[PDB]
Ligand binder design. Structure first.
Ligand SMILES: CC(C)=CCC[C@@]1(C)Oc2ccc(C(=O)O)cc2C[C@@H]1O
Ligand SMILES: CC(C)=CCC[C@@]1(C)Oc2ccc(C(=O)O)cc2C[C@@H]1O
Lengths: 120, 120
C-alpha cells in the first residue's frame, strides 16, 4: 500500500543515506502534526524536520520492513522492523507498531509508536 | 574486511534474492566444514548447501549489518544484526555473534553462532 504512513516508512532509509530527502516531510505530515516516537512529542513542521535531521544524523545505514493496515476507524497501523549501523559504528535492531491519524487529504496529523523490541 | 566470514555475511542477503548465489559456498567453507547456527550441526558441502537452500527459501527479503574482528588465536568473530520479511509475510529481527575457525587457505572449517537477540 502507499498511504502516508507507507511513504513515511519508505523515507526512513532514504533519508539516512540522503538527509535532504527530508524536504518531502510536508507531503507526509500535516502542518501542525504531532509525532511521538518514544516519550517526547514533537509538533509542527519546523520541529518535525529538525527532529528527523538529528535522528538520521545518528544513523550510518538502515533497512526497514513494514506491513500496513487501515483500521475500522480510518487510523493507519504499520508493524515494522529495523536493522541498522549507527553513526558510532554500533549495530542495532528494533521493532514496533505505528498508529497514524490522517486528515481528509490523507496526511498524518498524529503519529504514535510503541516498541515491541526496543532499540538495542 | 573481506575475510571468509565477511563473504558469508555478504552472501546472506544476496542469496535470499537469488538462491543460485549459494553455488559460491565452496569459496567460503572448506569441504567437510561444520556449521552450527542454533543447536544442530550441519557438516559438509552437500548438507551445508541444502541447509542454506531451505533457510533462504523461508525468507522473502533481508538486510544484514555486521562488524568483523580477527581474535588473538586467528579465530574470526563477527557481530551481526538482521531485519527481514519472512516468506509467511511475518517480520523479524535478530542479532548475534559468529565465530569461525579458518584453515590455512582462509576458508571456514567451523562456524558457530550465539544469539544476543533471538529471532522474533
Ligand atoms: C526518519 C524517518 C523518516 C522515519 C523513521 C521510521 C522509524 C520506524 O524508524 C525507527 C528507527 C529506529 C528507531 C530507534 O528507536 O532507534 C525508532 C524508529 C521509529 C521510526 O518512526
Ligand atoms: C544464508 C547465508 C549465506 C547466511 C545467513 C547469515 C546469518 C547471520 O543470518 C541469519 C539470519 C536469520 C537468523 C535466524 O535465526 O532467523 C539466523 C542467522 C544466522 C546466519 O548465520
Amino acid at each position: 500500500t502507499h498511504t502516508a504512513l507507507d511513504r513515511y516508512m519508505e523515507l526512513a532509509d532514504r533519508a539516512v543515506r540522503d538527509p535532504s530527502a527530508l524536504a518531502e516531510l510536508p507531503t507526509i505530515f500535516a502542518p501542525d502534526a504531532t509525532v511521538t516516537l518514544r516519550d517526547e512529542p514533537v509538533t509542527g513542521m519546523p520541529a518535525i524536520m529538525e527532529f528527523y535531521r538529528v535522528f538520521v544524523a545518528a544513523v550510518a545505514e538502515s533497512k526497514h520492513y513494514w506491513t500496513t493496515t487501515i483500521l475500522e476507524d480510518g487510523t493507519i497501523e504499520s508493524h515494522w522492523v529495523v536493522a541498522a549501523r549507527r553513526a558510532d559504528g554500533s549495530l542495532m535492531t528494533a521493532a514496533g507498531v505505528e498508529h497514524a491519524t490522517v486528515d481528509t487529504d490523507g496526511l498524518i496529523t498524529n503519529l504514535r509508536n510503541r516498541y515491541t523490541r526496543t532499540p538495542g
